[PDB]
Design a protein around this ligand. Structure first.
Ligand code: NA
Length: 994
């Protein structure tokens, strides 16, 4: 039964065939449980460790590597020798990286925590129900409650289900519906039915929501809905039904996996199509098996030299590093893949109160009527200084400090601001500053009366903690607070019934002090007060009031106006039903307008600036606020979202206006809007969908499970640090300070970080190019392998990893924020860039094989056989080219490999310097620009040597220390890699910039 709030308490009992005095019967319980199921949100997929481990092998590149370990394993088995201490190293090393890879992946999952499982935090274990099979109340597990159950809740209880309140046993019932919104301000529930069947939760004043808490009172009610049919349950379904796509980088990286694979295969087929000459060879003779071991040997190397094995670690270390860096700037990112996303943010939808504004209220002005006399009318406008909650400030008329007590209208004005208020003050000695107790807008009033002191009461004597509520405590003693009629959006005001203090046997003298939004309150006034006198409200004097109100809340003041009035002749205390809020507007009528107070909720000092950075960065800003349309726009012009004098007729909507627009038109309104005022529950989410249909990377703020759906949908869900824990777990980032600027600062941090990733990404991949050139080269030239898997891996994970990581510290461009949001579609490498790395590739691959050949030829230590070409044979089954000589295993000399490897390592350290800037020369941007890079190179070289002398290692890799001549050769063949790219960059700068 979903519409319970709109039905009568009787209808809800009838509907379920249950008696309030006895409850459900064991039969009914059985059937109700059978039909609606247990009261609890469904479980999450029990992702088993085993399945989780298997997932660590879903990727295509890992399969290849796994496959490669397989061929490696067999090769290191179907081989004939004795060196079993350096034969299985390769296969075992591959398997071992896949293990750490799988091990790491599973570590994440165990620590990761989704928002749906966060919602189960709000469901209580037990509930208290009344069921026929017993007399007294009985407590059962909340999962056993069912729709129709008669339940019982009391102060402190966590509501077990969505409940239609039948009877309030205590004086009044109060609920903390905080988890839905965040504003712990308890609200008063009733039992009368709410008419509108489509009323949003905030107005279902006769309902209790599963997950909320009783702040005060005791109540009996009937269960309307349970499980996923409750409010939070329907919020759990929206979230679950929401799939968050892969980040631009993740998609672009996954696409790379496909191509890289399609290349690794084509290069293998390519190595085949080249030796097709073997078909034309006599079947007899030649070790066929030695022909297959040859291919599979290169297949392994080919694949291992194609995969950027260390890319994942480098990306992570960079993202992890940047994140701590963002956290120092108040941005707490929960998702590493988000850091990249944040950079492409094209639209930021932010709540105003507390994020764009400080949510530190303060009354700045107030006006009462000076005099009425026919068509002539004059008001008395005042100003108040001080903007803290502290009672320090002053009132001034035309800047001249006046004294409140000298004006009667201000005496009463103050009486209303004090008596018609549920908030107070308190001096926090610990912090040394006065803090608010209750609501912001109301404490602003408690503070106001203190600076006003309409009774010139001696307060300067009083301490500090005592000074807090001095003038208030005074006004209170003057009036007894019989009771108070709560605020409700229908009427938009609240009142308090007060009687005099010094009264024994009297039946006259009572008063009602009304407070609320101007339009409604003023429309119910037939009287305007002029000091102590009272005169009728007339057409003109009403314009003046409304006129000013409009000037204060719409003008450069952007003030929230509150009208204050009192009902002189309030209906008799007995003729009033304090049970039907529906009767409150009636009870608050035929009032007398006293005055108005305009309060300000100030823009964070850093917002004005931050909004400009966005404009520079092509990032749109949409303010979502609760202010009426007029003041919403006013505040927009004030912070820079709107031009002070520009048209916005079609860029600011109220939830109402928006709803009326037909689907097609809303989608439109969202592409050009910057202001949404009085937004409905389903709007942040609908605003996010529309924004995505235009491919906008969207950021959306929020808190409370209310916003969790929108948070989850938006690409960058942003939660307040002070927000609920569900809003947090449902978001990409959390604002430690709740400040809008923290968002912008983080978006700029994401642009810096993504630029630096493009660098180490291209660096590493480009490096794999030279490797596949080397391997493919050595093959299509029948040369002795220049480099081997065990080695290639060390370079891709260690040698190249250190530089790649240091590249993330590359200093950011000054124009980082003066350029528009990066397009999600923008490819990493393309066009000229491809040619560049393709060339840089060729050279690196050529240079490695050549460094090997140089030793095998124009070198001493090795055969001086120039143009001898080992291409010819490698079986030595004839030993023709070397008649006189019993030697053929020099083809495996450790020197040639060592020459090529030192070339790779040294060339790549030089390429780490060519990566300091995409197109700027080393002349313009020096190497020392990034000190971390230098350090990394020294470290990587020290490691290279490390494997060259520490015995266990030089054998594992099959290397031998180089001669100063040989090393001096590596430098000669490496160093030129710089001029090469320097030449390529030059071309890019001078013949492409258009
Ligand atoms: Na999200």
């Amino acid at each position: 039964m979903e519409a319970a709030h709109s039905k009568s308490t009787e209808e809800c009992l009838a509907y379920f065939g249950v008696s309030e005095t006895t409850g459900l019967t064991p039969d009914q319980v059985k059937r109700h449980l059978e039909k609606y199921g247990h009261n609890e949100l469904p479980a999450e997929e029990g992702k088993s460790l085993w399945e989780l481990v298997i997932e660590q092998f879903e990727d295509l590149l890992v399969r290849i590597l796994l496959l490669a370990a397989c061929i490696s394993f067999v090769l290191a088995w179907f081989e004939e020798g004795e060196e079993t201490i350096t034969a299985f190293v390769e296969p075992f090393v591959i398997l071992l990286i896949l293990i750490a890879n799988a091990i790491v992946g599973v570590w994440q999952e165990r620590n990761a925590e989704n928002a749906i499982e966060a919602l189960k935090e709000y469901e209580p274990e037990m509930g208290k129900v009344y069921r026929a099979d017993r007399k007294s109340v009985q407590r059962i597990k909340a999962r056993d409650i069912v729709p129709g159950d008669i339940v019982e809740v009391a102060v402190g209880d966590k509501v077990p289900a969505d409940i239609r309140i039948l009877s309030i046993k205590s004086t009044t019932l109060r609920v903390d519906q905080s988890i839905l919104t965040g504003e712990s301000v308890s609200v008063i529930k009733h039992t009368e039915p709410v008419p509108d069947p489509r009323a949003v939760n905030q107005d279902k004043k006769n309902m209790l929501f599963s997950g909320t808490n009783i702040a005060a009172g005791k109540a009996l009610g009937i269960v309307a809905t349970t499980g996923v049919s409750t409010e939070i349950g329907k919020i759990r379904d929206q979230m679950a039904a929401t799939e968050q796509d892969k980040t631009p980088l993740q998609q672009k990286l996954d696409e790379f996996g496909e191509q890289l694979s399609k290349v690794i295969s084509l290069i293998c087929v390519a190595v085949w199509l080249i030796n097709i000459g073997h078909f034309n060879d006599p079947v007899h003779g030649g070790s066929w098996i030695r022909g297959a071991i040859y291919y599979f040997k290169i297949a392994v190397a080919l694949a291992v030299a194609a995969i950027p094995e260390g890319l994942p670690a480098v990306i992570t270390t960079c993202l992890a590093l940047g994140t701590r860096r963002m956290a120092k700037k108040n941005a707490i990112v929960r998702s590493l893949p988000s850091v990249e996303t944040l950079g492409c943010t094209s639209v930021i939808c932010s709540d105003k109160t507390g994020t764009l504004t400080t949510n530190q209220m303060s009354v700045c002005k107030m006006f009462i009527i000076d005099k009425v006399d026919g068509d002539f009318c004059s008001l008395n406008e005042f100003s108040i200084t001080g903007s803290t909650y502290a009672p320090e400030g002053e009132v001034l008329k035309n800047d001249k400090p006046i004294r409140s007590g000298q004006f009667d209208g201000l005496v009463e004005l103050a009486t209303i601001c004090a008596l018609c208020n549920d908030s107070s003050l308190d001096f926090n000695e610990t912090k040394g500053v006065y803090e608010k107790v209750g609501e912001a807008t109301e404490t602003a009033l408690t503070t106001l009366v203190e600076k006003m002191n309409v009774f010139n009461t001696e307060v300067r004597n009083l301490s500090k903690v005592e000074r807090a509520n001095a003038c208030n405590s005074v006004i209170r003693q003057l009036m007894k607070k019989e009771f108070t009629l709560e605020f409700s959006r229908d009427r938009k005001s609240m009142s308090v019934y007060c009687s005099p203090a010094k009264s024994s046997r009297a039946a006259v003298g009572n008063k009602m002090f009304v407070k609320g939004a101007p339009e409604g309150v003023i429309d119910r006034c037939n009287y305007v007060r002029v000091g102590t006198t009272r005169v009728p409200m007339t057409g003109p004097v009403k314009e003046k009031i409304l006129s000013v109100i409009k000037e204060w809340g719409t003008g450069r003041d952007t003030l929230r106006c509150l009208a204050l009035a009192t009902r002189d002749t309030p209906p008799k205390r007995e003729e009033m039903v304090l049970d039907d809020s529906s009767r409150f507007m009636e009870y608050e009528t035929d009032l007398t307008f006293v005055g108005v107070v305009g309060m300000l909720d100030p823009p964070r000092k850093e917002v004005m600036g931050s909004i400009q950075l966005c404009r520079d960065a092509g990032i749109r800003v949409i303010m979502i606020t609760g202010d009426n349309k007029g003041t919403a726009i006013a505040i927009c012009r004030r912070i820079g979202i709107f031009g002070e004098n520009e048209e916005v007729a079609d860029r600011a909507y109220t939830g109402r206006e928006f709803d009326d627009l037909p689907l097609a038109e809303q989608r439109e309104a969202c592409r050009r809007a910057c202001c949404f005022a009085r937004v409905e529950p389903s709007h942040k989410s609908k605003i996010v969908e529309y924004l995505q249909s235009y491919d906008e990377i969207t950021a959306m703020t929020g808190d409370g499970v209310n916003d969790a759906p929108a948070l989850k949908k938006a690409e960058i869900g942003i939660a307040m640090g002070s927000g609920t824990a569900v809003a947090k777990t449902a978001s990409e980032m959390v604002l430690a300070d709740d400040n809008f600027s923290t968002i912008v600062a983080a978006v700029e941090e994401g642009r810096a970080i993504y630029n630096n990733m493009k660098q180490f990404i291209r660096y590493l991949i480009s490096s794999n190019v030279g490797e596949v050139v080397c391997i493919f080269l050595t093959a299509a030239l029948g040369l002795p392998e220049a480099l081997i898997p065990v080695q290639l891996l060390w370079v891709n994970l260690v040698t190249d990893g250190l530089p790649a990581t240091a590249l993330g510290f590359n200093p950011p461009d000054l124009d980082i924020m003066d350029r528009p949001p990066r397009s999600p579609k923008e490819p990493l490498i393309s066009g000229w860039l491809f040619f560049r790395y393709m060339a840089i590739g060729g050279y690196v691959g050529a240079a490695t094989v050549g460094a090997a050949a140089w030793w095998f030829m124009y070198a001493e230590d090795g055969p001086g056989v120039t143009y001898h070409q080992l291409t010819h044979f490698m079986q030595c089954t004839e030993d023709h080219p070397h008649f006189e000589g019993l030697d053929c295993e020099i083809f495996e000399a450790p020197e040639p490999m060592t020459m090529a490897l030192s070339v790779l390592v040294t060339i790549e350290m030089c390429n780490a310097l060519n990566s300091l800037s995409e197109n700027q020369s080393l002349m313009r941007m020096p190497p020392w620009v990034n000190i971390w890079l230098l350090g990394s190179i020294c470290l990587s070289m020290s490691l290279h040597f490390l494997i060259l002398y520490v015995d266990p290692l030089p054998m594992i890799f099959k290397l031998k220390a180089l001669d100063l001549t040989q090393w001096l050769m590596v430098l000669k063949i490496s160093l030129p890699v710089i001029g090469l790219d320097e030449i390529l960059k030059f071309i890019a700068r001078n013949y492409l910039e258009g």
